Design a binder for this molecule. Structure first.
Ligand code: QOC
Lengths: 305, 301
């Protein structure tokens, strides 16, 4: 029993964290094989952040200008290239701790673990979701840039995020491991604001299924709804539309608990219109939306990595 | 900016997880140096669960009855001893991945990360606090026994918990790494119930200071209170009494935010009286009590 926000074990990712210092900027890098990946804004200082022609700035940097430190060992950079908003520093030593890995771009609603680092030193691990507005509600301080988001499938680490910046509302913006930003954000000093966020409906339903598995049933009702009628209600309460894909994905949970997806939808529909009435679901007074259907199945069935 | 429930990176603990099989029971073990630590109930049978004599059961065990598996390698047990509710299996190989570590017993309200394992294989890492009733609100399934709770001190791992059992309410009971249970619990199937839990008041205040550091101020008020008047209100909401130690511990946060502890106490009293009025504090509609004053300073500063 019990339901917690659980991150993937971070060991395989910790063995890849290095410190990248270029000029005055010191952030984290991801050392995989003989390449260190890190945000391209590391080559930026005063004017280089406001007007950043990154091809021009990078061409002025020599290999020795990048100080890469893996623990107490200094790595020597033998090349540098840029792929979108990520800098790739070729090094002379392949990381012996490189796990089996992939670079994946995740979609809004998908969850991942973040290993927050400062000075190439992992300080914490947390589970979060890619918001529908493409920001991550993270916990990051100055120096966390380069910290990565990951998932683990079997023995494969899927890298899905690299932290680049903090938006004025305290939320975070970053890129996949190919340097492509999530959302309409840029890595330059300009006025950027996160769009109005929405609730990840499929994840709220997955979390309601997890509550039923854990014995929390007060919110269940005798009613069901059409997907069209539920979506009308979801639009009204800033909830993401629920697609037929989402309904299919919730299938195993619907089978395990005996509550059809559209039946759970009518419970969610009531919760939105009537509130919790001073009651909690899994120790929370709000509807949690950062557990995907796969996370609920993984946690309530015990899949190991 | 931002405030999240953050667990310690689990890498140093993952390198210590092994599978311990004894008869039909299979649980997790913690391999540190040449010793594997695990709940002593791995030696228990069906007939020896209600009232097991562990000294008598372990004396009947031989080293070859314990199957220890570190990944794909089978470890050879060269000795066995028992320290309270923990079994210590001496092995012929010292764990090369053994980090700098300490065994620490923690107090209620203290937080730690849990690395949940199944079959000596880490499946997830989460954060939690030792409840005032000495249980942990965990997320554990069958096979998670031997999963450990830890905190990382720079390069040192302080092991503070080993999962032993699930109580009838879904909450969890375990021991420190010296086998001493937290709470009035025993490793027998006898009727055991967790006492009525209380809210960790010092942790809620630390979390309110974290909200102020993050720019959340709606809950602040012009009031202050005496420590005793705060305790009379707090106890009525099943909140732990706030001691002078707790007030001292919140000192740095009081200095950083300019809000005296007894001033924040009055904000908490108001919050307990009024509720949240459909507002959130750090993205939560309930008062969070699983962030200690130390966690808030570490995460924010
Ligand atoms: O409770 C136990 C164990 C146990 C039982 C009784 C006594 Cl007295 C003791 Cl010392 C230990 C048996 C193995 C599994 N286990 C569990 C531990 N955590 C979460 C569980 C969730 C669901 C089912 C079992 C769980």
């Amino acid at each position: 029993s019990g339901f917690r926000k659980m991150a993937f074990p971070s060991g395989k990712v910790e063995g890849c964290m290095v410190q990248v210092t270029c000029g005055t900027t010191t952030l984290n890098g991801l050392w995989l094989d003989d390449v260190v990946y890190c945000p391209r804004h590391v080559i930026c200082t005063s004017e280089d952040m406001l007007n950043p022609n990154y091809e021009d700035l990078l061409i002025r940097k020599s290999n020795h200008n990048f100080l890469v430190q893996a623990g107490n060992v200094q790595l020597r950079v033998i090349g540098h290239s840029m792929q979108n908003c990520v800098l790739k520093l070729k090094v002379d030593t392949a990381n012996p701790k490189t796990p089996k890995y992939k670079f994946v771009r995740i979609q809004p609603g998908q969850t991942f673990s973040v290993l927050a680092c400062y000075n190439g030193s992992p300080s914490g691990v947390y589970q979060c979701a890619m918001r529908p507005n493409f920001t991550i509600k993270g916990s990051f301080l100055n120096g966390s840039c380069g910290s990565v988001g990951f998932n683990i499938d079997y023995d494969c680490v899927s890298f899905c995020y690299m932290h680049h910046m903090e938006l004025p509302t305290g939320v975070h913006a970053g890129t996949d491991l190919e340097g492509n930003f999530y959302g309409p954000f840029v890595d330059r000093q300009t006025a950027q604001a996160a769009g109005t966020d929405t609730t990840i409906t499929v994840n709220v339903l997955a979390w309601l299924y997890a509550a039923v598995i854990n014995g929390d049933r007060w919110f269940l009702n005798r009613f069901t709804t059409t997907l069209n009628d539920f979506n009308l209600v979801a639009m009204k309460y800033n909830y993401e539309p629920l697609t037929q894909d989402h309904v299919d994905i919730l299938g195993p949970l619907s089978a395990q608990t005996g509550i059809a997806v559209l039946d759970m939808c009518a419970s969610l529909k009531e919760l939105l219109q009537n509130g919790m009435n001073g009651r909690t679901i899994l120790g929370s007074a709000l509807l949690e939306d950062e557990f995907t259907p796969f996370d609920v199945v993984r946690q309530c069935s015990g899949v190991t990595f």
